[PDB]
A paper describes a structure:
Here, we report on the structural determination of PorX, a noncanonical RR that comprises a classic REC domain and an additional enzymatic effector domain that exhibits phosphodiesterase activity. Our crystal structures reveal that the PorXFJ adopts a two-domain dimeric fold with a classical RR receiver domain's fold and a unique alkaline phosphatase superfamily (APS) domain connected by a helical linker region. Each PorXFJ monomer adopts a two-lobed fold containing an N-terminal receiver (REC) domain (residues 1–120), followed by a three-helix bundle (THB) domain (residues 121–209) and a C-terminal APS domain (residues 210–517). All PorXFJ dimers adopt an intertwined assembly, where each monomer is symmetrically wrapped around the other monomer, forming an overall “X”-like shape.
The primitive orthorhombic crystal form gave rise to a single dimeric assembly (two monomers in the asymmetric unit), while the primitive monoclinic crystal form gave rise to two identical dimeric assemblies (four monomers in the asymmetric unit). In addition, in the primitive monoclinic crystal form, spherical densities, in dimensions suitable to accommodate sulfate ion (mimicking phosphate ion) originating from the crystallization condition, were clearly observed in the REC domain phosphorylation site. Moreover, in one of the monomers of the primitive monoclinic crystal form, residues 358–369 were flexible and their backbone could not be traced in the density map, while in the other monomers they adopted a helical conformation, further establishing the dynamic nature of this area of the protein. Here, our structural comparisons revealed that the APS site binding pocket of PorXFJ is extensive and is, therefore, likely to bind a large substrate. In support of this notion, in the primitive monoclinic crystal form, two phospho-mimicking sulfate ions were identified and modeled at PorXFJ's APS binding cavity. One sulfate ion was modeled next to the catalytic Thr271, while the other was located in an auxiliary binding cleft and stabilized by Arg275, Lys329, and Asn357. These findings further suggest that PorXFJ's potential ligand might not only be large but also include polyphosphate moieties such as cyclic di-nucleotides or polynucleotides.
Author numbering:
A (entry chain B), B (entry chain A): 2 to 517
The structure:
């Protein structure tokens, strides 16, 4: 099976040197000197690729292209033309041409196009495979050598780079090697946090940017430039790899200006971390300064009701004098309504949007078999996230914002992790259920599995009484009650949970973009 | 905001004519003469794109590329080099280069690369929009000019071509124009079937290939070539557009040899149409010849239990002497098990796999808000299907089959349609609750909404008595019982159902592929 090329050109006899060149490289070329007969040939025969000129007496190559793609849209098509006109370039690109080569053409430039457009998947798979064999050892080495939070960020970015490259490989041996490096990463990172998290709360401490610092340290510098209105979107419960999975979709509308990885406070829970973003305060100080807004034990509905109030209070405290609105999207319909009415916010200095879709999807994975099959592993969950995003009102909002010349800031409260191993726990139940952190007056737990803080106020968290403590799951543990243990294990094994310590949960993107 | 180019080349002074050219076109170029300095610049500054030569004293461009992509993988990178070596070409392509231009390079070839890699999304949107304005009238005209089943097939393929192209459009006014052309198409197509379906059962009638013809007419010619073993996959309940949505994924492993649109029998239901594929018989003749296998009144689990038996009987009747096995996958775990054990089927002439995923996903949309948000429209359902497929055991099975040099045949029983408008119905308490067809001895219905067949034996369907009849929903109607009406209507409105007449349900792909 030689690769079969259909070349359409009214002057095809002048390109016979190119045809001989390709035929010596095991390509079979069929020629046509008009579009009509070329289309007929293309319907009847199976060609791997088509080359087209633009200028033909009968019908333009661009017309021929549109007709051919209607008949078989999966066939790559390359324009080989004398035309250097920007309008023709744009027409070709807009018609989903694979490449556009300007005559006179180096035969090897044509060969390149053939390899780039027919063999890329194979070449990338081969290259990625061979590279990761050489690189997996270096990553383990670097992982063993990590002794700073900045180094943890850098390592995490290396892991993610490779995790994404490996998702277009079929070899399971290699994928398991990476899954094991992630496990080792989280183990070592868990210990790092256990040893350093408390010191970060000492005065004048060297510490990463965290939830309660975020708005003041990273958003306000963008506001104070006073060059553009800002859409500040907090996508609830987004992992760094989920961001990566739709980075390229966003890059069509927005150019990245700044990317700062930052750290969620503990617990890595929406009620604590996300409220902290908006308040600019640790949860202890939200309880002290806003007792009417802050909730400790609460049912699932009522954890993040006062974010607008928190944010406006912070904006006042920082003495910004800005037109600013807050919206929380909790469903499709609300999303649509904001995309439809977004024009009305042109006058604003700041529009802040919380987008809840994740944590309804993570919940769905626990409850139904189909969502489990769609999110079987992290690769699938990334795929499913990308699908959601591509077809979400959130992307429509971003599109709107770009048309109105808004700056886009994109971040999240905290990520999630696939939990695998149950760790036993006893203690009177909280109203809302979390599987990676607990707070209580009499908590029983396996100490090896959890970071324990016996004096919560030292890390900016509320204490119910003098005895109270917090525990945070490490690794991929989930905290299972001893009563009902077997059903807890069956239900929640291999679900996405949050609240504890992992790279996925704790290290998260903050992203600034300018519209294109 | 000029577009910012970083150009790395030890001989950058020789490229000053190119830089002047680009600077007149509103590009800003920053130059570097070695990879190290270039990497430093790339970390510090935000470049839209990077140009690299290969041959440099310090570092290979290929090395520089790998370093840069690790730091920011979303930035396109173009190699501009004297090198015509296939290994360098392949390394660049394998490293995810965006384009590879061979010096000396026409400045306009560079301009093309810039536009293709930075502006394609916009250019495609603009071109698709402008093209559909010019085409929408011609589509309506083509719909008016339909006088044959072949014409219906061609029209359906035109509609699908445009529906997918308009996926890349934000303008809703134009999308609604197309949705309305589809509605008119289904209206007219419903009437076509109403007028022609019975006459198609006369021999000597000009008729499309249908379920009961499929295996004999289209699979057996491939078996009788005796050149390769065949994996015959029936993806349960797949629409043509769902196939289109993952056509390119499959094209990495398999080259399309043949595509025949064919027509599902009525009802467009798995119990009738899929059993007919395997039996080679209409349901009436399955009842007569295989009473033990055919079931009229059966639970949803008991509808397609005897497909292996039907198929082996057909293979015998056609006097083929082939090693043939059948598998029905009903869950992830079963899918995995077959992909893991596929090597063991090396000797087989035919492997037949029924893959049930899609019917469960449509039920999920009905029962859960999250699936509804992920499949809000047909575009989202296509996106969600693509995601499933990319991460499915079915693709693993296909991959295995390709490694073993199997020919791939891909088809489906019938599609599904988003139902919108209830049509009232009484009677027909059949065990399973299908929403687009009913059979019973005394049916009350709105006759405008349904194709009615008073004597089922005339269209190859079973009749409980001479009073029995069948009804098939047209357009986007669903059959709603009068009892509990309001809750029935809320539950099933905007769900994917099947059993009736539409382009989506009835016209479906049969696809033959050779392995790559
Ligand atoms: Mg010409
Ligand atoms: Mg050089």
């Amino acid at each position: 099976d030689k690769i079969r090329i259909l070349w359409v050109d009214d002057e095809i006899d002048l390109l016979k040197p190119h045809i001989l060149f390709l035929e010596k490289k095991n390509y079979e070329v069929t020629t046509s000197n008009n579009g009509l007969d070329a289309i007929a040939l293309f319907e009847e025969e199976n060609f791997d690729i088509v080359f087209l000129d633009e200028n033909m007496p009968g019908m333009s190559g661009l017309e021929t292209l549109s007709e051919m793609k209607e008949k078989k849209s999966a066939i790559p098509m390359i324009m080989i033309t004398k035309s250097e006109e920007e309008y023709i370039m744009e027409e070709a690109i807009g018609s989903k041409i694979a490449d556009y080569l300007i005559k006179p053409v180096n035969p090897n430039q044509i060969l390149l196009s053939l390899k780039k457009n027919l063999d890329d998947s194979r070449l990338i798979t081969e290259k990625t495979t061979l590279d990761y064999q050489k690189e997996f050892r270096k990553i383990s080495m670097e992982l063993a050598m990590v002794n700073s939070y900045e180094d943890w960020v850098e390592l995490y970015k290396k892991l993610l780079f490779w995790e994404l490259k490996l998702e277009d490989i079929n070899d399971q041996a290699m994928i398991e090697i990476l899954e094991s490096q992630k496990v080792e990463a989280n183990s070592q990172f868990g210990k790092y946090i256990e040893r350093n998290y408390e010191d970060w709360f000492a005065p004048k401490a060297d510490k990463p940017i965290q939830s309660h610092n975020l708005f003041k340290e990273l958003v306000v510098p963008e506001i104070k430039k006073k060059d553009k209105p800002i859409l500040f979107v907090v996508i609830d419960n987004l992992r760094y790899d989920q961001w990566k999975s739709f980075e390229t979709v966003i890059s069509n509308y927005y150019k990245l200006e700044k990317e700062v990885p930052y750290f969620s406070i503990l617990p890595t829970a929406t009620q604590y971390a996300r409220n902290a973003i908006f308040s600019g305060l640790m949860p202890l100080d939200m309880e002290k300064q806003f007792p009417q807004y802050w909730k400790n034990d609460v049912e699932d509905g009522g954890k993040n009701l006062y974010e607008a109030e928190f944010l406006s209070a912070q904006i006042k405290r920082l003495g910004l004098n800005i037109k600013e609105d807050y919206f929380k999207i909790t469903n499709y319909a609300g999303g649509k309504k904001l995309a439809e009415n977004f024009k009305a916010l042109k006058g604003n200095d700041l529009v802040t949007v919380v987008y809840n879709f994740v944590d309804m999807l993570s919940h769905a994975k626990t409850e139904m078999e189909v969502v489990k099959e769609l999110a079987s592993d992290d690769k699938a969950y990334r795929s499913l996230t990308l699908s959601w995003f591509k077809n979400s009102p959130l992307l429509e909002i971003i599109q709107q914002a770009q048309l109105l010349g808004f700056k886009l800031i994109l971040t999240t409260d905290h990520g999630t992790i696939n939990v695998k191993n149950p760790s036993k726990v006893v203690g009177d139940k909280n109203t809302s259920l979390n599987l990676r952190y607990k707070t209580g007056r009499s908590l029983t737990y396996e100490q090896k599995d959890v970071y324990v803080v016996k004096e919560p106020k030292t890390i900016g968290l509320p204490a119910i009484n003098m005895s109270s403590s917090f525990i945070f799951a490490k690794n991929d543990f989930f905290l299972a009650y001893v009563n009902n243990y077997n059903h807890y294990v069956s239900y929640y094994k291999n679900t996405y949970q949050h609240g504890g310590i992992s790279l996925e949960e704790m290290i998260i993107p903050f992203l600034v973009f300018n519209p294109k």
